[PDB]
Amino acid sequence: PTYAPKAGDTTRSWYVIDATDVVLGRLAVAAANLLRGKHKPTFAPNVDGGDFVIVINADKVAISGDKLQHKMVYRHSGYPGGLHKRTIGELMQRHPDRVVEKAILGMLPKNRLSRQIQRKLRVYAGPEHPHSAQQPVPYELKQVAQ
Amino acid sequence: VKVNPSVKPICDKCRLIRRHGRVMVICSDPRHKQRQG
Amino acid sequence: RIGKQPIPVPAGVDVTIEGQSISVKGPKGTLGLTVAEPIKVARNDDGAIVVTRPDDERRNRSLHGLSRTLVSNLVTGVTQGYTTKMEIFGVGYRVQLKGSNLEFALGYSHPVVIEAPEGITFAVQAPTKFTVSGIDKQKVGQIAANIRRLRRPDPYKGKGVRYEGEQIRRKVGK
Amino acid sequence: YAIVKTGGKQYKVAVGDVVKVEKLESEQGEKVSLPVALVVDGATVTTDAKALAKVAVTGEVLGHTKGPKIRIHKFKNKTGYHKRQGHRQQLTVLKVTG
Amino acid sequence: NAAARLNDITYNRLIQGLKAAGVEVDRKNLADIAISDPAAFTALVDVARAALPEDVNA
Amino acid sequence: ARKGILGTKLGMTQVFDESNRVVPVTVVKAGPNVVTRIRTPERDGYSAVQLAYGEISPRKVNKPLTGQYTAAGVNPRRYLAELRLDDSDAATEYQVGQELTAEIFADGSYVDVTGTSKGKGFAGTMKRHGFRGQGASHGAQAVHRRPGSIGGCATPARVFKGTRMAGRMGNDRVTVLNLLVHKVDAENGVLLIKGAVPGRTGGLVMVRSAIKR
RNA sequence: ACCGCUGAAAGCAUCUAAGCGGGAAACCUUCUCCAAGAUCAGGUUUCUCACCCACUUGGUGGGAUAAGGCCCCCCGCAGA
RNA sequence: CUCGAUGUCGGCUCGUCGCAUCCUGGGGCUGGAGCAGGUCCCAAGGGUUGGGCUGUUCGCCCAUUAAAGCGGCACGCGAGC
């Protein structure tokens, strides 16, 4: 049997990802793995280990220029018509953190633990995050081996 | 422009240029100025 | 044989690579430029300019031709003037250079004060002839076509704000 | 602690730890020796296979309990087919003394 | 896989090493010594590294 | 700035204008009873102003509200509404403890007047949506005044959202725009407004200067 | 859509590859209205703040109330 | 698929969506003098009437009109007529 998931057994560290120049897919996958807590071996799909992830400088996160003007973010309102098409271009010059957060939430599983997990991801446009109360340690991305 | 989706040159002055997705032609005399699709 | 022109410069003022961007001052104002990274632009040891980049991959070539004629734009636009002569054709225009700026009128009410942007100059020679100038050839041409595209091409008589003509079309009449 | 290998499965036990292992041929009292795959002293782990064929875990078979009543009731559909059969997997309890 | 990538090796190469080295542990007990003993697991990872051939040719 | 003021409406009249026409006019007492409590665009990112208006006894209001009137330094007021100002604070246009009056609207300055309607009740789909409801004689069994249908059969096997249906209408804040003020009685309070102001007679009404000129 | 400037590759010509500009009742804005159950459940401000019992001191329940609100009652051009 | 029931046409009421646009918006060409006109491109936001004959959709007509779309949704809509 396992010994990893129990009561008060999981550890809560923090992470700051500087979305400086990185591309959106790698960034979101990395934040999602940190957020679920697969970077951790003491893992289980029932419990919520994983670290509060902060994504800073999400204003300048790289997307293909040919995608800032083509890839659209539709969001339907139930009312007939009411399909609210919107590219990530205007969506970026309005809420880049919403773009990033959308990608991350999309890479998480689809369940209630997904909600309890995504409540752990903060994302900010400028370099300046307010959650410095902790010791948010910078996690930068690194392809591994093989 | 006359838009037919099979574009050829008309005279001995049409230039089968390509311009941002649509393949248009230009003979510098807008008699046809046709364009593809 | 595109690569047989490295830029010279008469006045030789500010022509040196301040970090992959060029600028030139002198008899005219100054200008900048943001050229693509896979371009190499260097100086010449008598004071001239040179340009290349030893990659041969079919973007080297597009950037070759452009980058070269665009740095030419810069320097031979500051030293050598940039100006286009546009002749009114038809009836009814006589200029008022109000402030430094032009007010048009041909064939309708409300003479139109064409905005005086930053970094151009309006010139006139007659009621039926004027011209524009500046430092940036693209600026010059864009405003020169803003002035054209006024009373769109009509072949039946010709009311053309032209570029010293350049062969406007003609009628089929009645 | 050693990863004893028994019953086609493998178990991780140090000394003195009970294990619900397969129906070993045995009684109570008489001990029994079981091979390992990996035995560890914290920082001295044993890995080389010939160094492990020497290390033998040993423990006293005892209890010979049964597993729990695994109720099978196969039932497909309109087919109209039921097959109900159960199962008590025979087991044994084990202590570890090596 | 998580403990492996903690040791900079991927699960694939970890298994290929624990195979070529031959330590007949199985994913269950391998995960147990992963949880409780980061030390024993890192010994296992060095075992696997020492039992990888050279490259992506063979 | 968008010069606005509160006030209640006293009812309609008609007044004859300069050119010997009629002005079917609404009287709105915007009287000199509107005091302020600024809202900085820095503490809370509005740049709005807190206009008060009303006459109540201390006994009539609860402790939080009277505390806000004291911290602003004003004696309480039955209403306490707010008006956005700008992308700017400008620190001199208003003041906490200021006083307003209907006098800003300068006899011709178009206002746009906003306020809650008169509740037309739980009004069915013909007092509510203007349905040319089904016939009245030619056999129509029971469906005079009744909606009719709500969508189609099997693909929208569902009634679309926002389907015009019966429900409680009325009371919703409405803004009637561009109401040219015909006169301004700063000598007994009122402000004449050539038009039809929304709401019950004797009810809150915010008279904002227009946006359309 | 179309128009255009600068401009190559492809010593030219091109609205295009880099660049920039025009451009419509259509898109986001602007306006009118809902709206923090926006669970990401916001904000500015104001008000009240020992408050007594028993336990397993405590937490934990209880009880008492503060400010507040409700229920009763008189009503409404507010309303099933 | 539905026969141990999926109520058929037209009208009404209420819609709603598509663009293959009738009008309104921007355009290119025109064998486009001006008025216009004819054809092609983009464009769905609104708008797209009233009657006579017909159970009639289909039409024909009268008077307009900016124009008097062409379709989908069980040839939308009968626990709504």
UniProtKB/TrEMBL annotation, chain A:
Gene Ontology terms describing biological process: negative regulation of translation; translation
Chain segments annotated as coiled-coil in the UniProt record: none
Gene Ontology annotations for the cellular component aspect, listed alphabetically: cytosolic large ribosomal subunit
Signal peptide boundaries: none
GO terms assigned for molecular function: mRNA binding; structural constituent of ribosome
Keywords of this entry: Ribonucleoprotein, Ribosomal protein
Region spans: Disordered: 127-146
The protein's assembly and partners: Part of the 50S ribosomal subunit.
Family, as annotated: Belongs to the universal ribosomal protein uL13 family.
Role, per record: This protein is one of the early assembly proteins of the 50S ribosomal subunit, although it is not seen to bind rRNA by itself. It is important during the early stages of 50S assembly.
Name this polypeptide is given: Large ribosomal subunit protein uL13
Organism: Mycobacterium tuberculosis
Portion of the parent chain present: 50 to 195 of 195
Automatic annotation (TrEMBL), chain C:
Molecular function terms, GO-annotated: rRNA binding; structural constituent of ribosome
Keyword terms, alphabetized: Ribonucleoprotein, Ribosomal protein, RNA-binding, rRNA-binding
BP GO annotations: cytoplasmic translation
Domain Large ribosomal subunit protein uL6 alpha-beta, residue spans: 9-81, 89-163
Subunit field text: Part of the 50S ribosomal subunit.
HAMAP family: Ribosomal_uL6_B
Protein name according to UniProt: Large ribosomal subunit protein uL6
The organism's taxonomic lineage, starting at the top: Bacteria, Bacillati, Actinomycetota, Actinomycetes, Mycobacteriales
From TrEMBL, chain E:
GO cellular component entries: ribonucleoprotein complex; ribosome
One BP term from GO: ribosomal large subunit assembly
Highest taxon above the source species: Bacteria
Alphabetic keyword roster: Ribonucleoprotein, Ribosomal protein, RNA-binding, rRNA-binding
GO molecular function per UniProt: rRNA binding; structural constituent of ribosome
Membrane-spanning segments: none
Function: Binds directly to 23S ribosomal RNA and is necessary for the in vitro assembly process of the 50S ribosomal subunit. It is not involved in the protein synthesizing functions of that subunit.
Family in the record: Belongs to the bacterial ribosomal protein bL20 family.
Descriptive protein name: Large ribosomal subunit protein bL20
From TrEMBL, chain F:
InterPro entries on file: Ribosomal_uL3 (IPR000597), Ribosomal_uL3_bac/org-type (IPR019927), Ribosomal_uL3_CS (IPR019926), Transl_B-barrel_sf (IPR009000)
GO-annotated molecular function: rRNA binding; structural constituent of ribosome
Gene Ontology CC annotation, any one: cytosolic large ribosomal subunit
GO biological process: translation
PROSITE patterns: RIBOSOMAL_L3 (PS00474)
A Pfam family annotated for this UniProt entry: Ribosomal_L3
Superkingdom to which the source organism belongs: Bacteria
Keywords: Ribonucleoprotein, Ribosomal protein, RNA-binding, rRNA-binding
Matches recorded under NCBIfam families: L3_bact
HAMAP family tied to this protein: Ribosomal_uL3_B
Record family assignment: Belongs to the universal ribosomal protein uL3 family.
The protein's role, per its UniProt record: One of the primary rRNA binding proteins, it binds directly near the 3'-end of the 23S rRNA, where it nucleates assembly of the 50S subunit.
Assembly information from the UniProt record: Part of the 50S ribosomal subunit. Forms a cluster with proteins L14 and L19.
Protein name: Large ribosomal subunit protein uL3
Species of the source: Mycobacterium tuberculosis
Source species taxonomy: Bacteria, Bacillati, Actinomycetota, Actinomycetes, Mycobacteriales
